Amino acid sequence: IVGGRRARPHAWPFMVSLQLRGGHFCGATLIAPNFVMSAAHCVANVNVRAVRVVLGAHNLSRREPTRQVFAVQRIFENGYDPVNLLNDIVILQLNGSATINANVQVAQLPAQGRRLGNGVQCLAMGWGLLGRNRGIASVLQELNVTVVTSLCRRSNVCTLVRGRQAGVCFGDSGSPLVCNGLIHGIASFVRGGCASGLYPDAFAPVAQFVNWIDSIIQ
Ligand SMILES: *[C@@H]1O[C@H](CO[C@@H]2O[C@@H](C)[C@@H](O)[C@@H](O)[C@@H]2O)[C@@H](O[C@@H]2O[C@H](CO)[C@@H](O)[C@H](O)[C@H]2NC(C)=O)[C@H](O)[C@H]1NC(C)=O
Numbered sequence: 640i641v642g643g644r645r646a647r648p649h650a651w652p653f654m655v656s657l658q659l660r661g662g663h664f665c666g667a668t669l670i671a672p673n674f675v676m677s678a679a680h681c682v683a684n685v686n687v688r689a690v691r692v693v694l695g696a697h698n699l700s701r702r703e704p705t706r707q708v709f710a711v712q713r714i715f716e717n718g719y720d721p722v723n724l725l726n727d728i729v730i731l732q733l734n735g736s737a738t739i740n741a742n743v744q745v746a747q748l749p750a751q752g753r754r755l756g757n758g759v760q761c762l763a764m765g766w767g768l769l770g771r772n773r774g775i776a777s778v779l780q781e782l783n784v785t786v787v788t789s790l791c792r793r794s795n796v797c798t799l800v801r802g803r804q805a806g807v808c809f810g811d812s813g814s815p816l817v818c819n820g821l822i823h824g825i826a827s828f829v830r831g832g833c834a835s836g837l838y839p840d841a842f843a844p845v846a847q848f849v850n851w852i853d854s855i856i857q
């Protein structure tokens with residue numbers, strides 16, 4: 640997250656960190672005790688058997704007892720286009736079930752087909768890079784963003800910070816976009832670099848896949 644702020648500890652108990660060898664590489668969302676939701680390109684060209692799904696985290700630099708770690712058991716993709724970044728969504732079933740508590744909770748999804756209009760205020764978040772060679776973020780970052788439809792494809796939900804250069808960046812992929820308490824987006828890609836100030840950030844549209852999601856997580 641470039642130009643954002645530190646989130647309050649465990650403010651978003653659905654927020655997940657995908658890690659390889661102790662290193663965060665993507666975000667994800669706990670959509671059920673044994674299912675998370677992330678971007679298909681976050682698990683593309685990686686060893687999924689080595690991916691660790693870390694729940695209930697806040698500060699990645701400390702070993703926090705609030706954490707619950709899981710592995711990937713099953714992979715679900717529905718037409719992910721790696722060249723055009725279409726349907727950049729993957730549902731990952733975990734090797735177990737999370738214990739629901741103050742720090743680990745299931746998120747709420749919108750209704751199938753619900754589309755957000757221009758101007759809606761949303762909140763992005765992630766452990767991605769902080770910006771200009773600043774490096775990765777240890778504590779969870781969040782960012783107030785505004786939905787925009789111009790310079791955006793219908794197969795994406797796009798957001799833009801008005802008045803200043805800020806947005807998602809490397810390491811934020813797969814992280815959720817929260818609008819009105821619902822997960823409407825999965826961080827997918829940026830244009831013109833991070834915090835370009837010109838090109839909106841692009842999220843995979845969670846609403847377009849709810850029926851598919853529901854069919855898998857019952
Ligand atoms: C579900 O999986 C987790 C994760 O296991 C680690 O991550 C995988 C990618 C792979 O490297 C596995 O070999 C690893 O075990 C399990 O977490 C471990 O639990 C053991 C015993 O309780 C503990 O010693 C380890 O520290 C844990 N590993 C962590 C936290 O990374 C977890 O036990 C599995 N749960 C079930 C129900 O199978």
Ligand SMILES: *[C@@H]1O[C@H](CO[C@@H]2O[C@@H](C)[C@@H](O)[C@@H](O)[C@@H]2O)[C@@H](O[C@@H]2O[C@H](CO)[C@@H](O)[C@H](O)[C@H]2NC(C)=O)[C@H](O)[C@H]1NC(C)=O
Nearest residue numbers: 650651759760761762763782783784816817818819820821
């Ligand atoms: C900056 O964003 C916060 C958070 O946005 C709200 O909550 C998110 C989880 C998501 O659902 C967004 O769509 C929401 O807009 C804004 O916080 C709310 O602010 C109102 C007062 O304006 C307050 O009554 C609520 O309690 C706040 N909700 C929180 C903190 O969760 C905040 O207003 C935004 N600020 C600016 C300057 O845009």
Ligand SMILES: [Br-]
Nearest residue numbers: 642643644782
């Ligand atoms: Br901020």
Ligand SMILES: [Br-]
Nearest residue numbers: 775776777778
């Ligand atoms: Br930080």
